[PDB]
């Protein structure tokens, strides 16, 4: 799979912009201080989730990710989207 | 600003991965049929919000970025992310 970036105008009609948002996905809450996610090149409060080992995290409730998370082994690849120069 | 995809690998020690997850973010939940978001090459179900007109929507709560979007006047530019070959 992949991830697109991209952006989209909008102009409103009679009804305004014409959709709607939710609240949900799944991001890096807390790093244990000295912990595997904390050592340098890992991972960042904020992190939002992408994939764990390769399966998307798109449409999990923080439950099933959470779970999914539990289930992938000693070793764990996570895909991550984090915001920089903010 | 940008938005970074990166992948981390971490090996559980003692005390596991060491780290946490959260529940949030945005997303778009629905597109009415024949709206500005519909038209071709626009929004899409399941889109996350990242930024509207260039301001992040990174650890708001769902009323911040629909008041947000709502304060962007006639005109909106939404940065999104879209899962794709899923």
Redesign the interface.
């Known amino acids: 799979?992949?991830?697109?970036?991209?952006?989209?105008?909008?102009?409103?009609?009679g009804?305004?912009?014409?959709?709607?948002?939710?609240?949900?996905?799944?991001?890096?809450?807390?790093?244990?201080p000295?912990?595997?996610?904390?050592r340098a090149?890992?991972?960042r409060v904020?992190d939002?989730?992408?994939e764990v080992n390769g399966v998307?995290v798109?449409?999990l409730?923080?439950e099933e990710?959470?779970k999914l998370?539990r289930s992938s082994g000693?070793?764990?690849?996570?895909?991550?989207?984090?915001?920089?120069?903010?």
């Open positions: 799979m992949g991830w697109e970036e991209l952006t989209v105008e909008l102009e409103k009609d009804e305004g912009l014409g959709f709607s948002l939710g609240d949900g996905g799944i991001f890096v809450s807390s790093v244990v000295g912990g595997p996610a904390a090149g890992r991972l904020g939002r989730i992408l998307s798109e449409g409730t923080l990710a959470v998370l000693t070793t764990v690849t996570l895909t991550v989207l984090r915001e920089r120069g903010g």
